[PDB]
Amino acid sequence: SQDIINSFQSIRQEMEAYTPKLTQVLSSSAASSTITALSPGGALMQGGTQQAINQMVPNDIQSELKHLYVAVGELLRHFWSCFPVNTPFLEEKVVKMKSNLERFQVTKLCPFQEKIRRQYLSTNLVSHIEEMLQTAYNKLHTWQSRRLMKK
Amino acid sequence: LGMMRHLYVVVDGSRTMEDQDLKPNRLTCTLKLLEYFVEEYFDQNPISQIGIIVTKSKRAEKLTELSGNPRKHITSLKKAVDMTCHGEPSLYNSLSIAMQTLKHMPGHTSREVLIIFSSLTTCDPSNIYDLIKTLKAAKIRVSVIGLSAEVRVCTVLARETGGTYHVILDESHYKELLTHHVSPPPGNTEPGLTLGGYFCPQCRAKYCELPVECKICGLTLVSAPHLARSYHHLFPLDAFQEIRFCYGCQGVCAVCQNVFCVDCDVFVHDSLHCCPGCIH
Amino acid sequence: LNLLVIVVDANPIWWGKQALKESQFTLSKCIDAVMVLGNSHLFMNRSNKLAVIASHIQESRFLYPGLLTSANEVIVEEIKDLMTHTETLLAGSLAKALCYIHRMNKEVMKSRILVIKAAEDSALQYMNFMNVIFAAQKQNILIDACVLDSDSGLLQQACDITGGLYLKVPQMPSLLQYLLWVFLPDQDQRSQLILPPPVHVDYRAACFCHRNLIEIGYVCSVCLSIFCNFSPICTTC
Ligand SMILES: [Zn+2]
Ligand SMILES: [Zn+2]
Ligand SMILES: [Zn+2]
Ligand SMILES: [Zn+2]
Ligand SMILES: [Zn+2]
C-alpha cells in the first residue's frame, strides 16, 4: 500500500496547471495516421474480405466439410456421453478405454484427410475442427490425472 | 418466484381443422397464435422447454423434441402450415407420447401439457380413465383449450390432473387464453455460459446465435444477461417517505439519507430498480 | 434533441499512475479531449444539450450543469475541485446519467451516453451495473464506450444490449480523432456511415458468494442465482 498514497498525491498537484486547448489537444501527424487506421484498408481486415475463400468454390469442399462435421460430431457424442457419467464402474472404464483408441484413430483419419484436401492450394482453414478433437485429447489427459488422484 | 416448466403443446390435426369461424383456415389460426405463444413463453421463462406434438388419423407424431430452442419451434410451425389434416385425432396416444418422455424429468420442475383441441371425438384404442390415474401419479398438469364445444372427457382430464379447461368465444378470446399459460406457477442445473460471440465452453462446438443446449456434450448454454433480468424481485428495493436540490437528477431514501424528487421517485422504483445513492 | 451525456473515468489512482509513468498522456490531456467533443456536440445542431459526469472514488459529481466560454470554464473549475476503495465505481455514474436523461425527457428527444473508461473493471458491482443497462435499453438510450488500455468485460455487454458502439483505442494521444469519428454522429446519421464493428463480447456471470467471472457454473431453478462449483443446496432461500 505504498503506491496508492503517492499516485493520489501526484494527481492532486497536477490539477492546478490546466486547460491548454489550441495545439495541446491533437497533433497533425497522429491525427493523419488515424485516417489510415479507420480506412477500409487499415485495421479492417474483416472489411476487405467478407466471405471465406474455402480453398475452391464452396461446393465441393463444403460437401467434404459437411462430411467432416458428421465424422467428428457423431463420434464425439459417444465420447462426451461416457465422459459425463463418472460411474466408477468397469463397464464405463472399458468403454473409456475403447473410446480412447478410436479417438486416437479419429486423429490420423482426419489429419491425413486434411493432408489430402489442403495440399492442392492449402487456402482454407481446417484447424477450426482440430480444437474439437484437441478438446477430446486433453480431456483424456486430465481424467487420467484425476483417476491417479482418486486412487 | 416461478419454477422450471417442461410444457408440451398438443395441436389437433383433425378433419375439423378446415372449418371457418376463425381466420379462414382453423389450423392456420392456431399456428399463428402458437408462434406468438412460443416467443412470449421464453421471455417470461429463461431456462424452460417446449415440445410440440400433433395428432392425425388415430396417431400422434412428435413434431419437435423437447428442447429449449426459441427458433427451432417457430421454423417448424411455419413448415406445418400446409398439413393435410385427414382423419380424427387421439387423446390416449398423444398423452402417451407426452408421458414416455415427460416422466423422466427431475422432480423439482413443473411438467405440463397444453392440449389445443378442435375436434369432438377422440378415437383411441385404449381406455382414457387409467391415463388420468397415471398422469395424476406422475404429477403432470394437463390443461386443455377447446374449440366450439365442451367435451366431457376434457373436463375430467383437466380437473383431476390439475389443469384448466376453457372454450373459445372468438380469436380475441383465444389469444387471451394462451397468455394465461405463459406465466409460471409459484435443484441446481449445470449450464455453461457462451463467451466469445457464441461458442461452447465444454467442447468448443461452435454454432449459431442461440440459447439452445449443446448438441454434442449435452450441456445447456444460456446467456447470462438473460438471467440477469429476472433479478431485483429477490432482495427488492423498498419504498420511500416524503415530506429543490436532488441527488439523481440534480435539480427521500431512508437507507442512505439521500433526497430525491418526484420525477426520480417514480423512476428509481419502477425502471431503475436500484437506489443510485446505495451503489456508492 | 440529441442529448449526449459523457461519463469520464476520473479514477485518481489510475490517472496518477500514468502521470508518473511518463506516457505523455495525463488527465489534463484527456478532459480537454472531452471538452472539445463537448464543444463539438454543441455545434452540429442549434438545440443540442450536454452533460458531463466524472467518476471519482466514492463520489460522482456532475460537471457541466452546475457561449462555450461559460460551458468550458465550469468543467475546468470542477476538475480543479473534485481531484483535490482503490477501484473506481461506474454504475453509480450511469445511474445518475439515466436519472438526468429521464428528467430532461419530461420537459419536451433521443439521448445517448458515452463512457470513456480508463481503469480496469470492478466485478463487485455487476448486480447493479446490469440493472442500469436494462433501464437504458427500455428507453432506447445508447451506451457508447471507448476504452484506453484494457477491455472492460462489463462495458462490452452495455453496448450490445443497448445497441451502441465499442471501440478500443490503440493510441492514447490520438483520442480526439476517434471521438470525432465514431461518437460524434448521432443515432440517425450512424446508419449512413462506416464504423468498426464489434469484435468480441465478454459474456460471463458472477457467483453470489465470490463474484468471480465464471464460464461454466450452476444455476438454481427457482432463484436463478448462478453459483460456483459447489451446488449443495440453494443458498438464498
Ligand atoms: Zn459442449
Ligand atoms: Zn430528482
Ligand atoms: Zn438508498
Ligand atoms: Zn432458489
Ligand atoms: Zn463462486
UniProtKB/Swiss-Prot annotation, chain A:
The gene is GTF2H1. Component of the general transcription and DNA repair factor IIH (TFIIH) core complex, which is involved in general and transcription-coupled nucleotide excision repair (NER) of damaged DNA and, when complexed to CAK, in RNA transcription by RNA polymerase II. In NER, TFIIH acts by opening DNA around the lesion to allow the excision of the damaged oligonucleotide and its replacement by a new DNA fragment. In transcription, TFIIH has an essential role in transcription initiation. Keywords: Acetylation, DNA damage, DNA repair, Host-virus interaction, Nucleus, Phosphoprotein, Repeat, Transcription, Transcription regulation, Ubl conjugation. One of its GO terms (cellular component) is nucleoplasm. This is General transcription factor IIH subunit 1. Belongs to the TFB1 family. It comes from the Eukaryota. It comes from Homo sapiens (Human). Component of the 7-subunit TFIIH core complex composed of XPB/ERCC3, XPD/ERCC2, GTF2H1, GTF2H2, GTF2H3, GTF2H4 and GTF2H5, which is active in NER. The core complex associates with the 3-subunit CDK-activating kinase (CAK) module composed of CCNH/cyclin H, CDK7 and MNAT1 to form the 10-subunit holoenzyme (holo-TFIIH) active in transcription. Interacts with PUF60. (Microbial infection) Interacts with Rift valley fever virus NSs (via OmegaXaV motif); the interaction leads to TFIIH complex proteasomal degradation. The chain holds residues 397 to 547 of 548 of the full protein. (Microbial infection) Upon Rift valley fever virus infection, interacts with NSs leading to ubiquitination by the NSs-FBXO3 E3 ligase and proteasome-dependent degradation. GO terms for molecular function: chromatin binding; nuclear thyroid hormone receptor binding. It is found in: Nucleus. The keyword Acetylation applies. Its main location: nucleus.
UniProtKB/Swiss-Prot annotation, chain B:
Changing C246A: No effect on the transcriptional activity of the reconstituted TFIIH complex. Widely expressed, with higher expression in skeletal muscle. Signal peptide: none annotated. It is found in: Nucleus. Keywords: DNA damage, DNA repair, Host-virus interaction, Metal-binding, Nucleus, Phosphoprotein, Transcription, Transcription regulation, Zinc, Zinc-finger. The modification Phosphotyrosine is found at Y41. A zinc finger (C4-type) spans 200-217. Component of the general transcription and DNA repair factor IIH (TFIIH) core complex, which is involved in general and transcription-coupled nucleotide excision repair (NER) of damaged DNA and, when complexed to CAK, in RNA transcription by RNA polymerase II. In NER, TFIIH acts by opening DNA around the lesion to allow the excision of the damaged oligonucleotide and its replacement by a new DNA fragment. In transcription, TFIIH has an essential role in transcription initiation. Component of the TFIID-containing RNA polymerase II pre-initiation complex that is composed of TBP and at least GTF2A1, GTF2A2, GTF2E1, GTF2E2, GTF2F1, GTF2H2, GTF2H3, GTF2H4, GTF2H5, GTF2B, TCEA1, ERCC2 and ERCC3. Component of the 7-subunit TFIIH core complex composed of XPB/ERCC3, XPD/ERCC2, GTF2H1, GTF2H2, GTF2H3, GTF2H4 and GTF2H5, which is active in NER. The core complex associates with the 3-subunit CDK-activating kinase (CAK) module composed of CCNH/cyclin H, CDK7 and MNAT1 to form the 10-subunit holoenzyme (holo-TFIIH) active in transcription. (Microbial infection) Interacts with varicella-zoster virus IE63 protein. Belongs to the GTF2H2 family. This is General transcription factor IIH subunit 2. It comes from Homo sapiens. The chain holds residues 55 to 387 of 395 of the full protein.
Curated annotation (Swiss-Prot), chain C:
One of its GO terms (molecular function) is RNA polymerase II general transcription initiation factor activity. Keywords: DNA damage, DNA repair, Metal-binding, Nucleus, Transcription, Transcription regulation, Zinc, Zinc-finger. Its main location: nucleus. The keyword Transcription regulation applies. The keyword Zinc applies. GO terms for cellular component: core TFIIH complex portion of holo TFIIH complex; nucleoplasm; nucleus; transcription factor TFIID complex; transcription factor TFIIH core complex; transcription factor TFIIH holo complex; transcription preinitiation complex. Pfam families: Tfb4. Gene3D superfamilies: von Willebrand factor, type A domain. It is found in: Nucleus. A zinc finger (C4-type) spans 220-237. InterPro entries: TFIIH_Tfb4/GTF2H3 (IPR004600), vWFA_dom_sf (IPR036465). Component of the general transcription and DNA repair factor IIH (TFIIH) core complex, which is involved in general and transcription-coupled nucleotide excision repair (NER) of damaged DNA and, when complexed to CAK, in RNA transcription by RNA polymerase II. In NER, TFIIH acts by opening DNA around the lesion to allow the excision of the damaged oligonucleotide and its replacement by a new DNA fragment. In transcription, TFIIH has an essential role in transcription initiation. Belongs to the TFB4 family. Part of a TFIID-containing RNA polymerase II pre-initiation complex that is composed of TBP and at least GTF2A1, GTF2A2, GTF2E1, GTF2E2, GTF2F1, GTF2H2, GTF2H3, GTF2H4, GTF2H5, GTF2B, TCEA1, ERCC2, ERCC3, TAF1, TAF2, TAF3, TAF4, TAF5, TAF6, TAF7, TAF8, TAF9, TAF10, TAF11, TAF12 and TAF13. Component of the 7-subunit TFIIH core complex composed of XPB/ERCC3, XPD/ERCC2, GTF2H1, GTF2H2, GTF2H3, GTF2H4 and GTF2H5, which is active in NER. This is General transcription factor IIH subunit 3.
